[PDB]
C-alpha cells in the first residue's frame, strides 16, 4: 500500500525558514512525481509545486516560486519541501501527495497526513496532561465518562488517541480553545462501560510535536 510519511508540526519564527520531509512507501519512489499542497481556511486547497524524484526535475505554481524549494533523496525515498522567509501567510497545513493517471488526466490519489506550520515569534509550550476521572457525577445509564485535559500549550496541534489507537468508539476530542495568554487548551473524553471499570485500563496518548511532548496519562476512578 502506498503511504506518505509526514511530520506533525513545526513552529517557525517570522523571517526564518523551514524544511519538512515526506517519506514515501509501498511504491517505487522515483517512478512518480511528488506534489505539495497547502490548505488554509481562507484560501482553501492550493497546489504548490511538484518534483520528479526520477532525476530531480521541478515545477512550481507561480505564487510559491519564491517560497518553495523541492528536493528528493533518491536513496532515502524521502521528498523535502523548503519554505523560506516565513510570514503569517505561510501558516497552514502542508500536504505531500501522490498522483495517478486515468483517462489522460491526473488526480491526487494518496495524501500524507500533513504538516501544520505555525508562523509565530512566541515560544513553544508543552502542555500539562491532567486526568478527567470517572465518578458518580460522571455516570449515565450504565456508562461512565472519563478523559484527559491537555492544558496550556503552543502552538497547535495536539493529537490525542486512546489506548494506542485501539479505543476509538465514543471518543470526543474537542477543538482547542484559544486562551487570553495566546496559549491553547484541549480536552478529550470517552464513555466506557461502568461495569468493566476495574478490569479495563484507559490511557490517553497525548502528542505535541513542536514541544516534543509524548505523554501517556492513565485516567482511573
Amino acid at each position: 500500500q502506498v503511504q506518505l510519511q509526514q511530520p506533525g508540526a513545526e513552529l517557525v519564527k517570522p523571517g526564518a525558514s523551514v524544511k519538512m520531509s515526506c517519506k514515501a512507501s509501498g511504491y517505487t519512489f522515483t517512478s512518480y512525481n511528488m506534489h505539495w499542497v497547502k490548505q488554509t481556511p481562507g484560501r482553501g486547497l492550493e497546489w504548490i509545486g511538484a518534483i520528479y524524484p526520477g532525476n530531480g526535475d521541478t515545477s512550481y505554481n507561480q505564487k510559491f516560486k519564491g517560497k518553495a524549494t523541492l528536493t528528493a533523496d533518491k536513496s532515502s525515498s524521502t521528498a523535502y519541501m523548503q519554505l523560506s522567509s516565513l510570514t503569517s501567510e505561510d501558516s497552514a497545513v502542508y500536504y505531500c501527495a501522490r498522483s495517478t493517471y486515468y483517462g489522460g488526466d491526473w488526480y491526487f490519489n494518496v495524501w500524507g497526513a500533513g504538516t501544520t506550520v505555525t508562523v509565530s515569534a512566541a515560544s513553544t509550550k508543552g502542555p500539562s496532561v491532567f486526568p478527567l476521572a470517572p465518578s458518580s457525577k460522571s455516570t449515565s445509564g450504565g456508562t461512565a465518562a472519563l478523559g484527559c485535559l491537555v492544558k496550556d500549550y503552543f502552538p497547535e496541534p495536539v493529537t490525542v488517541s486512546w489506548n494506542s489507537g485501539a479505543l476509538t468508539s465514543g471518543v470526543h476530542t474537542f477543538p482547542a480553545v484559544l486562551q487570553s495568554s495566546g496559549l491553547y487548551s484541549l480536552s478529550s473524553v470517552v464513555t466506557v462501560p461502568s461495569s468493566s471499570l476495574g478490569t479495563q485500563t484507559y490511557i490517553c496518548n497525548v502528542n505535541h510535536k513542536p514541544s516534543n511532548t509524548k505523554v501517556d496519562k492513565k485516567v482511573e476512578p
Binding site: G44, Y102, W106, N109, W111, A145, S187, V189
Partner: protein, 211 residues
C-alpha cells in the same frame, strides 16, 4: 478556477442531494474529494464519474465542459463532510471552495457530566472544572457555570465537536478555570445546561473537598 454551490448543504437520510462545480474555462474532467475535520482529503470521484475504491454506489458524478456535479442518491449519516472538486486540464491544478454537507436528525438531549480538578493540577496552583455535554442535537446549547449558586462570567471557555459520522450529533465541553486560592473559597461547583431536548435546565454539581 472552480466554484462550488451551495457552500452548505443540509439534508436528512435518505434524501437525494446534488452539489455543483463550475469552472471558469472548460475542462476535460472534474475530480471530487471528501474531507472531514482533522484529516486529509480522500479521493472520492475521479475522471468526472468514476468512484474511488470503497466509495458507496450511492455516490455518482456527472457533467461536461464547464459544469459538473456530485450526487448522493440516498444520503447517510457518514456522508457529513466537505466536498472539493479539482481540475487538472491546465496548469496549475486548482480546487473548488468546497461544499459542506450537514445531516438532519431528530432532537437529542445532551448527557451531562462534570469533572472536578485533578489532584495534580490543584497542586500546581490552578483548578479547572470541566462540564461535558455528550451527543446532542441540534448544535445549539447553553452552558451556565454557577458557583455557590452565583452565575459566573469571564472564567470559562467552551468548544463544540464537528458532526458525528455515526449518529449525526454534536458534543461540547466547557472548562471553568479558577486559581487554587479562589477555588477553595467556595463549596458548590455546578454547570447548568439548557437545550431543546430538555423541558427544564439540567444541573450537574459537586461539593469541593467532599468525597
Amino acid at each position: 478556477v472552480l466554484s462550488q454551490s451551495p457552500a452548505i448543504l443540509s439534508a436528512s437520510p435518505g434524501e437525494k442531494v446534488t452539489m455543483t462545480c463550475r469552472a471558469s474555462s472548460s475542462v476535460s474532467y472534474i475530480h471530487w474529494f471528501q474531507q472531514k475535520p482533522g484529516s486529509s482529503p480522500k479521493p472520492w470521484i475521479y475522471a468526472t464519474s468514476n468512484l474511488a475504491s470503497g466509495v458507496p454506489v450511492r455516490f455518482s458524478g456527472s457533467g461536461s465542459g464547464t459544469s459538473y456535479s456530485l450526487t448522493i442518491s440516498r444520503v447517510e449519516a457518514e456522508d457529513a463532510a466537505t466536498y472539493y472538486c479539482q481540475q487538472w486540464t491546465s496548469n496549475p491544478p486548482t480546487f473548488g471552495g468546497g461544499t459542506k454537507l450537514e445531516i438532519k436528525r431528530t432532537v437529542a438531549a445532551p448527557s451531562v457530566f462534570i469533572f472536578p480538578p485533578s489532584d495534580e493540577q490543584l497542586k500546581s496552583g490552578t483548578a479547572s472544572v470541566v462540564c461535558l455535554l455528550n451527543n446532542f442535537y441540534p448544535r445549539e446549547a447553553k452552558v451556565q457555570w454557577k458557583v455557590d449558586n452565583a452565575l459566573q462570567s469571564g472564567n470559562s471557555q467552551e468548544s463544540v465537536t464537528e458532526q458525528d459520522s455515526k449518529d449525526s450529533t454534536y458534543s461540547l465541553s466547557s472548562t471553568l478555570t479558577l486559581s487554587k486560592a479562589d477555588y477553595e473559597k467556595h463549596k458548590v461547583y455546578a454547570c447548568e445546561v439548557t437545550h431543546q431536548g430538555l423541558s427544564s435546565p439540567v444541573t450537574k454539581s459537586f461539593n469541593r473537598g467532599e468525597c
